[PDB]
Amino acid sequence: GHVLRLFHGECLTISAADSDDQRRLVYYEGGAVCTHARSLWRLEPLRWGQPLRIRHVTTGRYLALTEDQGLVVVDACKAHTKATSFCFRVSKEKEIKYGESLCFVQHVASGLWLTYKKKAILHQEGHMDDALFLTRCQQEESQAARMIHSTAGLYNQFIKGLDSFSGKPALPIEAVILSLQDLIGYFEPPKQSKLRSLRNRQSLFQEEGMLSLVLNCIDRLNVYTTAAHFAEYAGEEAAESWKEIVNLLYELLASLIRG
């Protein structure tokens, strides 16, 4: 459905890119996050009591209860109905509008309440102030969150690709080339209002560690001195796109930093 933030009456969020917790844990945090992509979520119905999954947008992982870790955020492949299904409730005894309804979050199968940077958990009783506001975000933020998810998914497919034949004498070349080109245009400079918007989109990407990601590609391709050298490991067909991909990667990197 819609991409939103979840607030206390500070908001619901995972850690920043490259964090020791591996982005699996969930927290309530205030300050910078409230404007950053890591605190964005989408509600995916399988109205009060109606069962639904809560997906993390940029990582595409799903909120869940685990025997081993309790409340965590789980890979889509392990996101089965029992684990990942929640509903909203008006109260804690035994329809919905943004920025007005106070929502208690319950795990359907266990009856546990979402509760408590402070670490978020699922507890039998929890707290008075557990209720969350569902809060619409800006289009610009949701566009960026979706793009960050997509591009990360793609460059990691590309990286795992390079890794397979590293030291050993099918890569998404077209998708990657297309993705770089689109992002370079996306970060194109323009007027003052367009400038603020650009600085903001750069930032959203920097916090999701997109510089690291692009550099991880640059580093893995720079192991090769020539297209020909690359060919001995990758396709001769893929080596045709080597120079061009490293130029666009350097261009995207430059694009993220500029002005």
Report how far apart the termini are.
Answer: 35 Å
Q: How many H/I helices?
A: 8
Cα Rg: 21 Å
Residues in helix, %? 25-40%
Question: Beta-sheet strand percentage?
Answer: 15-25%
What is the name of the CATH architecture of the largest domain?
Trefoil
PDB class: metal transport
Keywords: calcium channel, SR/ER membrane, metal transport
Assembly: monomeric
Entry title: Crystal structure of the N-terminal two domains of the skeletal muscle ryanodine receptor (rabbit RyR1) residues 217-536
Short description:
This protein is an alpha+beta fold and 259 residues long.
Task: Characterise this structure.
29% of the residues are buried. The chain folds into 2 domains: 1-142, Trefoil (Acidic Fibroblast Growth Factor, subunit A), CATH 2.80.10.50; 143-259, Leucine-rich Repeat Variant, CATH 1.25.10.30. It has 259 residues and is of the alpha+beta class. The chain has helices at residues 81-84, 139-164, 173-186, 192-207, 210-221, 227-231, 236-239, 242-257, and strands at residues 3-8, 11-13, 27-29, 41-45, 52-56, 62-66, 70-74, 86-89, 102-107, 113-115, 118-119, 121-123, 132-136. Helix 2 (139-164) packs across helix 4 and helix 5 (210-221) runs antiparallel to helix 8. The strands form 4 sheets. A 6-stranded antiparallel β-sheet has the order 5-4-1-13-9-8. Strands 2-3-11 form a 3-stranded antiparallel β-sheet, with no helix packed on it. A two-stranded antiparallel sheet has the order 6-7. It comes from Oryctolagus cuniculus (Rabbit). Belongs to the ryanodine receptor (TC 1.A.3.1) family. RYR1 subfamily. This is Ryanodine receptor 1. It is found in: Sarcoplasmic reticulum membrane. Residues 1-46, 47-94, 95-138 form the MIR domain. It is classed as metal transport.
